[PDB]
Short mmCIF file of C-alpha atoms (C1' of nucleotides) in Angstrom, two decimals:
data_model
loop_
_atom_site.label_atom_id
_atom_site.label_comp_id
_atom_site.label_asym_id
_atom_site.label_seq_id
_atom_site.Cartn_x
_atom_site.Cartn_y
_atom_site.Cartn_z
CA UNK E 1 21.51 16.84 -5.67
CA UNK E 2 17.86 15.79 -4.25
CA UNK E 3 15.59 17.44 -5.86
CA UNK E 4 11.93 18.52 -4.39
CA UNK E 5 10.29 17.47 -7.39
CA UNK E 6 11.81 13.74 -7.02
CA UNK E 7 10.96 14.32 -2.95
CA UNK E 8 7.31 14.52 -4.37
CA UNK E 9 7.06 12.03 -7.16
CA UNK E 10 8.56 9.41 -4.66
CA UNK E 11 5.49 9.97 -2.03
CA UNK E 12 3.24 9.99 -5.13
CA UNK E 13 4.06 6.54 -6.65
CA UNK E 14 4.30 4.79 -3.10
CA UNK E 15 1.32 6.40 -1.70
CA UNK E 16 -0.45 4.51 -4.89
CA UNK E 17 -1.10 1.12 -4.64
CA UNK E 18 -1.22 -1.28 -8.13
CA UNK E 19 -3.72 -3.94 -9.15
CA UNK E 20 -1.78 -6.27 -9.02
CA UNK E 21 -2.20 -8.80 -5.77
CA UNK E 22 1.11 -10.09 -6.10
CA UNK E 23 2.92 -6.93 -7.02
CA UNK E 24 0.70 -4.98 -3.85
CA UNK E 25 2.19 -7.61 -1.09
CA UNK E 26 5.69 -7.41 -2.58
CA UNK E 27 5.56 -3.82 -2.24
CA UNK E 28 4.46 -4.05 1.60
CA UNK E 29 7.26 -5.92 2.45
CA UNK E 30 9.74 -3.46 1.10
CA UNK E 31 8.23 -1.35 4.21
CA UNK E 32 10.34 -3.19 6.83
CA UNK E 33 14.40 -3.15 6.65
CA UNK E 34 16.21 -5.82 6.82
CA UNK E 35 17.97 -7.28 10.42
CA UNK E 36 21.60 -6.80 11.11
CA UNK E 37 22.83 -9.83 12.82
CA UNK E 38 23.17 -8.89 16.55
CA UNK E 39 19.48 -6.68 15.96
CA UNK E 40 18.47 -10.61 15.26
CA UNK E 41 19.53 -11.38 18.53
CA UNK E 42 18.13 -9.06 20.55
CA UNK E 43 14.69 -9.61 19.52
CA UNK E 44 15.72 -13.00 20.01
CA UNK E 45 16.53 -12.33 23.56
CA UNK E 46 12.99 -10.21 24.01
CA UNK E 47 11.20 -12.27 22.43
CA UNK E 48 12.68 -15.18 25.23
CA UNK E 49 11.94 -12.93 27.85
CA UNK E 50 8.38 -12.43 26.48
CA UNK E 51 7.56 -15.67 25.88
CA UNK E 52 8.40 -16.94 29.62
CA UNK E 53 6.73 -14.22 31.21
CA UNK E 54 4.21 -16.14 29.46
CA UNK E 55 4.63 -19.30 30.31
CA UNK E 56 4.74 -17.99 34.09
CA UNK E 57 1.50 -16.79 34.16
CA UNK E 58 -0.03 -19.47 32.24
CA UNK E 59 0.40 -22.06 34.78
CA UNK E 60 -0.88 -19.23 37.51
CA UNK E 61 -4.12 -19.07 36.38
CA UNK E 62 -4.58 -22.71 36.58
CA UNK E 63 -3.71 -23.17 39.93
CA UNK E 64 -4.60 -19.46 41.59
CA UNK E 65 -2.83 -17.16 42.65
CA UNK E 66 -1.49 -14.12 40.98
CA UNK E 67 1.47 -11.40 41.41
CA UNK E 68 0.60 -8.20 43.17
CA UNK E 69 -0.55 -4.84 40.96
CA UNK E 70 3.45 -4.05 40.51
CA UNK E 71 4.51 -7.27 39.49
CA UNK E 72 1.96 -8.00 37.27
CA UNK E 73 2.42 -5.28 35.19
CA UNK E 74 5.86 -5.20 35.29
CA UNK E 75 5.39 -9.10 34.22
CA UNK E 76 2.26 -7.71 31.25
CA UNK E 77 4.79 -5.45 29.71
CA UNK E 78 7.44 -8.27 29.09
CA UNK E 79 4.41 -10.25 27.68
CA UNK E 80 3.47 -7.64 25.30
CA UNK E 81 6.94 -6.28 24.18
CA UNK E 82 7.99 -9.90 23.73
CA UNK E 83 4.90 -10.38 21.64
CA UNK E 84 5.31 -7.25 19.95
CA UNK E 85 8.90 -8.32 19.23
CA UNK E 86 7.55 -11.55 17.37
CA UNK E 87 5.58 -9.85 15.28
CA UNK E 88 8.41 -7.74 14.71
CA UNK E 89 11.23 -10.54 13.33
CA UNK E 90 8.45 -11.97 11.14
CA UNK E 91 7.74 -8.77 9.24
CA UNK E 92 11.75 -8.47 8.85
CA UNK E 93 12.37 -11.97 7.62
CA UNK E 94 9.16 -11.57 5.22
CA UNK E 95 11.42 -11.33 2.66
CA UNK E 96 13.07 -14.48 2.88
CA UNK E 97 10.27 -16.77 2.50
CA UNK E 98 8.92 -14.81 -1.24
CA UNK E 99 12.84 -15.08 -1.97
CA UNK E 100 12.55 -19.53 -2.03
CA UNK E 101 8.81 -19.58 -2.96
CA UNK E 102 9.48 -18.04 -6.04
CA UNK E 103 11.37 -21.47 -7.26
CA UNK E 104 8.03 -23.65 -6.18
CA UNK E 105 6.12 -21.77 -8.83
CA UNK E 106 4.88 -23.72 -12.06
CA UNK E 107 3.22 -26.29 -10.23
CA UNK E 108 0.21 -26.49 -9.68
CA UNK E 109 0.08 -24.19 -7.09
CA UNK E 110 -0.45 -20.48 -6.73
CA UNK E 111 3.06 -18.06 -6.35
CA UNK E 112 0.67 -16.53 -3.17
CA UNK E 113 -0.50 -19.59 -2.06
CA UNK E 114 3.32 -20.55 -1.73
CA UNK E 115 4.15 -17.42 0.19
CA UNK E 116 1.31 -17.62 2.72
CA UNK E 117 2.31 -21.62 3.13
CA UNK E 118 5.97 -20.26 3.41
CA UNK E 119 5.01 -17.68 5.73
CA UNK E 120 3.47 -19.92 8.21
CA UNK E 121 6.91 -22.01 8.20
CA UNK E 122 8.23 -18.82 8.79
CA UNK E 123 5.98 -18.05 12.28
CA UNK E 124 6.95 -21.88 13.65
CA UNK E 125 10.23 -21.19 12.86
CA UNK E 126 10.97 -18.14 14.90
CA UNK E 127 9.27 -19.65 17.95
CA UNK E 128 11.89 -22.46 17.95
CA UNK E 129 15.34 -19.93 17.07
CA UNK E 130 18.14 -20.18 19.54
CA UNK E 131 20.73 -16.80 20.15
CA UNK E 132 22.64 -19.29 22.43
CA UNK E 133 24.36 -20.56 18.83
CA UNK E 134 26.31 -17.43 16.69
CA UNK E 135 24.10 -18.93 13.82
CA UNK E 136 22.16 -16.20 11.98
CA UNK E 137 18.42 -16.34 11.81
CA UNK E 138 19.09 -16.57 8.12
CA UNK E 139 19.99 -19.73 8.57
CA UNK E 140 17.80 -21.77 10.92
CA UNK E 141 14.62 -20.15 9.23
CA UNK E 142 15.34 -21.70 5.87
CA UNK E 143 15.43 -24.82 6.93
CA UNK E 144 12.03 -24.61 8.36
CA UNK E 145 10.18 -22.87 5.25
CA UNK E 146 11.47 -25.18 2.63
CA UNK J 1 -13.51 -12.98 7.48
CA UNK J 2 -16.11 -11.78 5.70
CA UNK J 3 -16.30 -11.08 1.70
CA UNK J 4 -18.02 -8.95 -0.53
CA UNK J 5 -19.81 -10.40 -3.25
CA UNK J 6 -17.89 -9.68 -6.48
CA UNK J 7 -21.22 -9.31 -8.63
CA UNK J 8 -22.53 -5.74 -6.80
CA UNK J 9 -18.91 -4.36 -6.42
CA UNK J 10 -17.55 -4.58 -10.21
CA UNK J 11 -20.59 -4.74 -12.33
CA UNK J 12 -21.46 -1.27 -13.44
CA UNK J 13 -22.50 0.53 -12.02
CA UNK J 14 -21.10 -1.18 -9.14
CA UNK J 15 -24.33 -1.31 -7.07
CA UNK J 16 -21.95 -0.96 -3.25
CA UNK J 17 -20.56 2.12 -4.28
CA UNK J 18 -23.97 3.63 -5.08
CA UNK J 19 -25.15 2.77 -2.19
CA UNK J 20 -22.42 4.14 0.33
CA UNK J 21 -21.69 7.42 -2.12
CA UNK J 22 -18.47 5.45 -2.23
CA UNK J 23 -16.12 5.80 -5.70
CA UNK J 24 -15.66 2.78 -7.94
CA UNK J 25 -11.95 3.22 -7.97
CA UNK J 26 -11.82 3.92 -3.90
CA UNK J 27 -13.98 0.60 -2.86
CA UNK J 28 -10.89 -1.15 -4.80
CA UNK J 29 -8.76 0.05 -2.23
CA UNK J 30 -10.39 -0.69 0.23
CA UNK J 31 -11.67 -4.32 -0.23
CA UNK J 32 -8.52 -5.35 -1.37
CA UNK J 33 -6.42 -4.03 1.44
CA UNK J 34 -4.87 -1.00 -0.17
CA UNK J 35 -6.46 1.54 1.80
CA UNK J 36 -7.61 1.99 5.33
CA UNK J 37 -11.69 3.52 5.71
CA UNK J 38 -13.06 5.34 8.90
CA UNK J 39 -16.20 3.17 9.97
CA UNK J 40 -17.47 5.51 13.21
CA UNK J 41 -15.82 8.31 15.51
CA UNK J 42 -17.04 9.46 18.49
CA UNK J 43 -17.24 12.87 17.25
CA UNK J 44 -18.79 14.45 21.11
CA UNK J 45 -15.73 12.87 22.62
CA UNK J 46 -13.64 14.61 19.33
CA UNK J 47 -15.70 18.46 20.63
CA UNK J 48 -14.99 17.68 24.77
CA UNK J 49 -11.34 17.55 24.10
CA UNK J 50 -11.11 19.50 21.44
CA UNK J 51 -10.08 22.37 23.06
CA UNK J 52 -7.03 20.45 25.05
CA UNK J 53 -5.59 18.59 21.79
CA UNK J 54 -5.15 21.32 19.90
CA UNK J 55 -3.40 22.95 22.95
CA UNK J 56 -0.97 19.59 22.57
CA UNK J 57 -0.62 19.51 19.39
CA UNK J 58 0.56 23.55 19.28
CA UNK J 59 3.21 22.65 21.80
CA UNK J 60 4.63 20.37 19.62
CA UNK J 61 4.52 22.44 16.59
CA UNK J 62 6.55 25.27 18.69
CA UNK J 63 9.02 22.72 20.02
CA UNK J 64 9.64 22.23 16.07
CA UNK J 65 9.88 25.65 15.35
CA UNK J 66 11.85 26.30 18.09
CA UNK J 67 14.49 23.49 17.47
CA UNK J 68 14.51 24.84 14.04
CA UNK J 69 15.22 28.83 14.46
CA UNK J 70 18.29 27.18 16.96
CA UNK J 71 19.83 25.40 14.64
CA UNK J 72 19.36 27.64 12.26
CA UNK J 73 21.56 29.90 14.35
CA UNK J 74 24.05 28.06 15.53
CA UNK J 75 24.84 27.31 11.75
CA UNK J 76 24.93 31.04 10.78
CA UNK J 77 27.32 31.03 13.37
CA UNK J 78 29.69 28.70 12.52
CA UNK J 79 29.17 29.71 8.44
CA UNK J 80 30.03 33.06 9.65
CA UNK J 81 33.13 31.95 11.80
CA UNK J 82 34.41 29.79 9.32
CA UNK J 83 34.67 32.29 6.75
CA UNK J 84 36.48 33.97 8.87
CA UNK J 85 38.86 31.67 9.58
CA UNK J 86 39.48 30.83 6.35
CA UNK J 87 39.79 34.30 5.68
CA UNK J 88 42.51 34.50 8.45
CA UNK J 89 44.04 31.89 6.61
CA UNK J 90 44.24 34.33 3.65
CA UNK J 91 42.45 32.27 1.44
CA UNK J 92 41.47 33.18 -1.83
CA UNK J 93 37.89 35.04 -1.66
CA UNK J 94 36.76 33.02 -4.41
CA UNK J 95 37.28 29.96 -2.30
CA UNK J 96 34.96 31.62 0.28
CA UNK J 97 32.01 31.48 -1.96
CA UNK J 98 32.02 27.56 -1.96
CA UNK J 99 32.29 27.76 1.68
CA UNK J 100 29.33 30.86 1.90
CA UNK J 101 27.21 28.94 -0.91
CA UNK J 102 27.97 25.43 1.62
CA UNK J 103 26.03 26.90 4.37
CA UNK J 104 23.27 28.61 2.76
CA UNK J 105 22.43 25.03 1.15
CA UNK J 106 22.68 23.40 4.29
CA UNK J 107 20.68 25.66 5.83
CA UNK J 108 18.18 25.17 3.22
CA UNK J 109 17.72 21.64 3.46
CA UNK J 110 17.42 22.21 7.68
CA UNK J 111 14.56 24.54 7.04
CA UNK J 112 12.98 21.93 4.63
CA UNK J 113 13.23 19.20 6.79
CA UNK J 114 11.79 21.23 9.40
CA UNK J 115 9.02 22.10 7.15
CA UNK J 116 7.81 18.35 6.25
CA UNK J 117 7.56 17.75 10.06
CA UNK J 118 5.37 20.92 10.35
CA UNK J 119 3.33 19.96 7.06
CA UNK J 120 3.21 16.43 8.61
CA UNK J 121 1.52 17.64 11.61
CA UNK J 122 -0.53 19.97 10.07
CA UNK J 123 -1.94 17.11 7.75
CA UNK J 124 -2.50 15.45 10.71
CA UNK J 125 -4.58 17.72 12.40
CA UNK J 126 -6.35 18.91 9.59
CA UNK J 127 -7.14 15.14 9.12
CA UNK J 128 -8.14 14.12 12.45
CA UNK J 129 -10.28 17.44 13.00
CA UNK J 130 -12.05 16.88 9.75
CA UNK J 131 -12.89 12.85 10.34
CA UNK J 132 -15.55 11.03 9.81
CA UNK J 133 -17.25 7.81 8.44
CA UNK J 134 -16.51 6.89 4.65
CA UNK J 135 -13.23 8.52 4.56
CA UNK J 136 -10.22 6.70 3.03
CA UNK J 137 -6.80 7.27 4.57
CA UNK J 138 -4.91 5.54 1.45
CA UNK J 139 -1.51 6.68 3.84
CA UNK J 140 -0.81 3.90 6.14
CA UNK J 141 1.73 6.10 7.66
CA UNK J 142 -0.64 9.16 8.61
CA UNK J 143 -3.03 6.75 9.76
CA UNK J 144 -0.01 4.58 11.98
CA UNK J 145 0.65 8.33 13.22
CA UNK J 146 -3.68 8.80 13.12
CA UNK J 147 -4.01 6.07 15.56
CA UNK J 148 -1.53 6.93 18.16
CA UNK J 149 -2.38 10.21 18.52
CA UNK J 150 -5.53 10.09 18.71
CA UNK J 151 -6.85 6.24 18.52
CA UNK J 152 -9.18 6.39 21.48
CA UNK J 153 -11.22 8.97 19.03
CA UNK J 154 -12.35 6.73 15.66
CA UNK J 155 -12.96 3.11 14.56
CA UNK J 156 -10.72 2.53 11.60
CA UNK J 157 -10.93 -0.53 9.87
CA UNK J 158 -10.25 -2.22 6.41
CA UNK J 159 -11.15 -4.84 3.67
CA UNK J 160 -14.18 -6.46 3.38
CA UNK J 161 -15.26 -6.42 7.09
CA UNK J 162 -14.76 -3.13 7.22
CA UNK J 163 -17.16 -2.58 4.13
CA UNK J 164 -19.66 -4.90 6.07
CA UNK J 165 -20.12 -2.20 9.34
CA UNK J 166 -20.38 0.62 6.73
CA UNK J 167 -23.81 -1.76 5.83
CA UNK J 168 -24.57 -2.26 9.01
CA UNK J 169 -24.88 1.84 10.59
CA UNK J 170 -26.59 2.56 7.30
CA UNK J 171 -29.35 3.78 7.69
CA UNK J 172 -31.46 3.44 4.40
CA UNK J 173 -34.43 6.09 5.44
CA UNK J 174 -32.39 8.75 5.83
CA UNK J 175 -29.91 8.17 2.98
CA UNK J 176 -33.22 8.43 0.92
CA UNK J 177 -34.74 11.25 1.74
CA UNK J 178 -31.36 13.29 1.33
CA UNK J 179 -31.35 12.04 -2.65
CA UNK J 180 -34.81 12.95 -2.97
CA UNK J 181 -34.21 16.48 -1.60
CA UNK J 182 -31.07 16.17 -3.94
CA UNK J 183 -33.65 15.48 -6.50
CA UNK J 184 -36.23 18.74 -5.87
CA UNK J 185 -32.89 20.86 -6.45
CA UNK J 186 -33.08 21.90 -10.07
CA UNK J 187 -29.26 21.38 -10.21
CA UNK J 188 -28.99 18.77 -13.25
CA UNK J 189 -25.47 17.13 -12.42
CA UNK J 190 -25.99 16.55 -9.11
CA UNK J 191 -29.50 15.64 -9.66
CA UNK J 192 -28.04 13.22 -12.34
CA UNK J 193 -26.09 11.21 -9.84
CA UNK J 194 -28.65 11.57 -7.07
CA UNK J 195 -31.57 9.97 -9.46
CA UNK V 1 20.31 19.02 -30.81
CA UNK V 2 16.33 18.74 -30.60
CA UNK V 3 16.25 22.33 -32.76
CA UNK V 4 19.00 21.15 -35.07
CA UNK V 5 17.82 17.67 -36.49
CA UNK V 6 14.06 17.95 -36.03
CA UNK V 7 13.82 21.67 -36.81
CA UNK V 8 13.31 21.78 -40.59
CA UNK V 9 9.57 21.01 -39.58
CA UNK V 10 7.43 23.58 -37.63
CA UNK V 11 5.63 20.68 -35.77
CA UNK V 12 8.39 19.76 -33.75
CA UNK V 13 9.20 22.95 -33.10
CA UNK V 14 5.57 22.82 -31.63
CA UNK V 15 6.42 19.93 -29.61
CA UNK V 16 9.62 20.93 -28.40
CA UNK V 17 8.28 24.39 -27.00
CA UNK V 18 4.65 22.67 -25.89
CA UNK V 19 7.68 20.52 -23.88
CA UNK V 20 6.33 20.17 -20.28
CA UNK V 21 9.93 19.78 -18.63
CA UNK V 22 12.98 19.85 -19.09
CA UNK V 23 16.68 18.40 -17.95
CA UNK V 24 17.90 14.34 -18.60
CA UNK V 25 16.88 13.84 -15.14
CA UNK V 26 13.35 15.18 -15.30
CA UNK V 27 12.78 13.11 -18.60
CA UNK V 28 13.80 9.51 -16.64
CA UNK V 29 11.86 10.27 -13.63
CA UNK V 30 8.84 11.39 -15.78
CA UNK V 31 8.69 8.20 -18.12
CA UNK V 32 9.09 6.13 -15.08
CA UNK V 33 6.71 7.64 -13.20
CA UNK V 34 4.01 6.95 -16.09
CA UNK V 35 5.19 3.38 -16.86
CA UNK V 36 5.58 1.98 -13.35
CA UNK V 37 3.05 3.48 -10.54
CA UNK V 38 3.50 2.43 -7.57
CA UNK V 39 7.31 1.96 -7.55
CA UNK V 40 10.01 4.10 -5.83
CA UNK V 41 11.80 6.52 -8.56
CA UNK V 42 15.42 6.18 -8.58
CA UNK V 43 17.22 8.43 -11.06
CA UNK V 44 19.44 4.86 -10.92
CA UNK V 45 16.46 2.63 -11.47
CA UNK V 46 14.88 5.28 -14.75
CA UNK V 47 17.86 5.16 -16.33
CA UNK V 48 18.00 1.14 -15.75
CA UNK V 49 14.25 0.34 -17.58
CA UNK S 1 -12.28 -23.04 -7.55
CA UNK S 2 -14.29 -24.48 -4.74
CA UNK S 3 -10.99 -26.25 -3.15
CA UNK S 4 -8.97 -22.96 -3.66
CA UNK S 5 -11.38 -21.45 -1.81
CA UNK S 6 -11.26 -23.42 1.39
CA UNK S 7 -7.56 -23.72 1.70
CA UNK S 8 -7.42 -20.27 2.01
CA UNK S 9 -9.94 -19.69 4.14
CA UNK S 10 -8.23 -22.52 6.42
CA UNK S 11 -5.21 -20.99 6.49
CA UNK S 12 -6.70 -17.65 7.54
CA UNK S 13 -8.16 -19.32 10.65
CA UNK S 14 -4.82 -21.39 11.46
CA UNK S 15 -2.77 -17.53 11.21
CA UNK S 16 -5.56 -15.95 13.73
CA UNK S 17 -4.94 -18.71 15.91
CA UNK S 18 -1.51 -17.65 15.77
CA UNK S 19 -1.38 -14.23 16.22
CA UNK S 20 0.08 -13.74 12.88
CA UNK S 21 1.47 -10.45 11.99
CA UNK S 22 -1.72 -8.18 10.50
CA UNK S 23 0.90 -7.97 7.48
CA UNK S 24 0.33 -11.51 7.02
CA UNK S 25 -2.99 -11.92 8.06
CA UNK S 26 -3.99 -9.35 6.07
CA UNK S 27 -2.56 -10.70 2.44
CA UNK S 28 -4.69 -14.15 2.77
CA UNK S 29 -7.96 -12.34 3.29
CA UNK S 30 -7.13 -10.24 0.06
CA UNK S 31 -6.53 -13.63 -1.19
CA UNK S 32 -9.50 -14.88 0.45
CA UNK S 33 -11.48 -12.16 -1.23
CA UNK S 34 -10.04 -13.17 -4.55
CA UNK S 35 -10.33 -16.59 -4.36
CA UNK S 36 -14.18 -16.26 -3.61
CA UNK S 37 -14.46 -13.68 -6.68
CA UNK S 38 -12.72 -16.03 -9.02
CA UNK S 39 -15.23 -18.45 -8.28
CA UNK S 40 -18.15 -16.15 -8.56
CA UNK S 41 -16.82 -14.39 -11.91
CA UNK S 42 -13.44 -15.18 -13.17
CA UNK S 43 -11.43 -12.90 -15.31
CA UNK S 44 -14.06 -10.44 -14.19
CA UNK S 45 -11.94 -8.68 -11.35
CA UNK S 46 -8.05 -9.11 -12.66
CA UNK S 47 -6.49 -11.73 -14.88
CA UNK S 48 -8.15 -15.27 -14.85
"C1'" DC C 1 -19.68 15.66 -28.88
"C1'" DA C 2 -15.36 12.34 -27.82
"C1'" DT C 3 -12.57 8.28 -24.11
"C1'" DC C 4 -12.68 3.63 -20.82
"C1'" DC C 5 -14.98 -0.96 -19.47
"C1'" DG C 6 -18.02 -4.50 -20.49
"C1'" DT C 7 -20.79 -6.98 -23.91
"C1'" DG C 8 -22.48 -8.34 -27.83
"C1'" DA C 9 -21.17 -10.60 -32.96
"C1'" DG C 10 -26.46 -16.90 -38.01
"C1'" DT C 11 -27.75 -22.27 -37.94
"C1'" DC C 12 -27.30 -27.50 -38.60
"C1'" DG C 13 -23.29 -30.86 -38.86
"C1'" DA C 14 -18.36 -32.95 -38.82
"C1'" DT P 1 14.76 -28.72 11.41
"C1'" DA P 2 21.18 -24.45 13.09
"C1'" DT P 3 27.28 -22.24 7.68
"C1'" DA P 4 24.54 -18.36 5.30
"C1'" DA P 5 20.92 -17.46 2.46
"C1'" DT P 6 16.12 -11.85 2.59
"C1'" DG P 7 11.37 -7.36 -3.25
"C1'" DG P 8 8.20 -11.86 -9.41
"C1'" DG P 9 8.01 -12.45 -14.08
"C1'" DA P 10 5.63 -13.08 -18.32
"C1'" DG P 11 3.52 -10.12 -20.62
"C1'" DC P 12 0.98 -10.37 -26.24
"C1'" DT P 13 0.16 -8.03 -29.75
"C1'" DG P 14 -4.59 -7.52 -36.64
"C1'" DT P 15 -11.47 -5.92 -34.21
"C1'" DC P 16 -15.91 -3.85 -33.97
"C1'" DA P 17 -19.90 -0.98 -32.77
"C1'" DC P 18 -22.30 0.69 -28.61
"C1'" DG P 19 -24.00 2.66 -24.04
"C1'" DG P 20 -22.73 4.84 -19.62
"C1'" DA P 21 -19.77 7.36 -16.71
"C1'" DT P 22 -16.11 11.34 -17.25
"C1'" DG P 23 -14.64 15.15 -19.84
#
DNA sequence: CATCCGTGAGTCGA
DNA sequence: TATAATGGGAGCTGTCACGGATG
């Protein structure tokens, strides 16, 4: 059924990025698969955990003190996979914002300048998304990018 | 972020790539975010660990190899022990050839998948061991893999910034003086380019 | 059917026989790959354009 | 030309400030790159 | 010796 | 600003003669 040549040409096209601006960011988003809904929530849940080991340490530095060598590792690692986990449900959902920015084109502004705007909706909404309601991220983030 | 100057990059001949021996058609990728480029590597660093990388990086190869000549087997195995029980099923032998042909297709595609790991991390280290500035890694996926393996090795970059430390550890003196030797070799195509 | 309706003329029979590759599926995947760079090849998405 | 310009390159300091993915980041200083080009030599690099 | 990109192709007036 | 929603869209058509980089 599969072919090697296919196996090849496949590697070939991707590998070979096209002139186009618009056509080269559509084709890095197709990179990233999409989210099932409960692989939403737990980034959602890291991404919680990330962002309050965070918020601990924040106020620590202010005032003084700090966790021993242990427990502030232990406490890094949440900060960085929680961080890394952002990054992570905003590369997912990239999809969704081209999908309604497409409809804004015609005026006046530029198809990429309406992505990038969209985008950046996109990155305030996932700091503000709730797992505590069975609501899909779907949902909550297009509020925020129209 | 910095950005190049659109005048000395696409007007021909496009004075940057001249300058860096870089191509026309690779400064495209790079500028414009299609391709990575390796700005330094810390090529002593590269030789005093040499020796220990490629010791890792066998290990890994066996542990592929190995995995792969087991389960190899243990499908020639059960090929050979379901023909066999089809064959105490009195079967017709004809309808043993779908079942021989079966196997010896699976085990085809096990070998090949086996083999584009191995080719994988053979481009790998042929890639890393061969490094060095003004190379493009147009693979994001090599160079994701690049990094992690050996990240603490090289400098890679990309875009226009990128293009800006090129600039900045070239050094103009001795970029001449290789053209002009260049140039003293009778050699007219490659004292065509060089002039 | 190549050799039957194009065959009175000995520069198709040229063609046919200078003919890089052949099968229905190596035709698709070739056009597409010549059209559209830069785009995953399907033999669903050849046959589509 | 001039105003496309800017609101690029103010958007690429507002996503740095916010960690944006290097997906992200990384489209608006193609754009960026573009934007400045279009405004040095249009139609030159591209469609106008 | 033949392809590909970029750059030429009259002036005044209305 | 909490139902769920997830990869664009018009291309543009009838030059011409030439030098430079590639063949």
């Amino acid at each position: 059924d599969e072919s090697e040549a296919l196996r090849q040409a496949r590697k070939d096209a991707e590998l070979t990025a096209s002139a186009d601006s618009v056509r080269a960011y559509l084709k890095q988003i197709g990179k990233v698969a999409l989210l099932n809904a409960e692989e939403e929530v737990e980034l959602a849940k890291r991404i919680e955990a990330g962002l309050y080991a965070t918020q601990l340490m924040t106020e620590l530095s202010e005032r003084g003190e700090k966790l021993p060598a242990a427990q502030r590792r232990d406490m890094m690692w949440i900060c960085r996979d929680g961080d890394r986990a952002k990054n992570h449900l905003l590369e997912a959902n990239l999809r969704l914002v081209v999908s309604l920015a497409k409809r804004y084109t015609g005026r006046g502004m530029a198809f990429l300048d309406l992505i990038q705007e969209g985008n950046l909706g996109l990155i305030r909404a996932v700091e503000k998304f709730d797992y505590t309601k069975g609501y899909k991220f779907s949902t909550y983030a297009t509020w925020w990018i129209r | 972020a910095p950005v190049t100057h659109i005048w000395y990059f696409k007007g021909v001949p496009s004075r940057l790539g001249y300058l860096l021996d870089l191509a026309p058609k690779d400064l495209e990728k790079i500028i414009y975010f299609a391709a990575y480029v390796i700005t330094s590597v810390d090529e002593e660093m590269r030789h005093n660990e040499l020796s220990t990388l490629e010791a890792e990086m066998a290990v890994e190869r066996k542990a592929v190899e190995d995995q792969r000549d087991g389960e190899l087997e243990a499908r020639a195995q059960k090929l050979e022990a379901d023909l066999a029980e089809l064959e105490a099923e009195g079967a017709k032998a004809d309808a043993r050839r779908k079942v021989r042909d079966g196997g010896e297709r699976e085990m085809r595609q096990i070998r090949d998948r086996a083999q584009r790991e191995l080719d994988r991390l053979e481009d790998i280290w042929s890639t890393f061991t061969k490094l060095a500035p003004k190379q493009l890694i147009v693979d994001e996926n090599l160079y994701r893999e690049l990094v992690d393996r050996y990240g603490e090795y090289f400098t890679g970059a990309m875009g226009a910034e990128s293009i800006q430390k090129l600039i900045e550890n070239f050094d103009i003196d001795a970029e001449a003086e290789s053209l002009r030797d260049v140039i003293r070799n009778g050699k007219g195509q490659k004292k065509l380019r060089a002039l | 059917q190549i050799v039957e309706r194009f065959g009175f003329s000995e520069i198709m029979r040229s063609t046919l026989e200078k003919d890089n590759t052949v099968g229905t599926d190596e035709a698709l995947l070739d056009i597409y790959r010549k059209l559209r760079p830069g785009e995953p090849p399907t033999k669903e998405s050849a046959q589509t354009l | 030309l001039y105003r496309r310009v800017i609101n690029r390159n103010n958007r690429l300091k507002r996503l740095i400030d916010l960690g944006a993915p290097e997906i992200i980041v990384n489209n608006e200083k193609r754009m960026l790159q573009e934007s400045v080009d279009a405004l040095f030599d249009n139609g030159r690099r591209g469609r106008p």
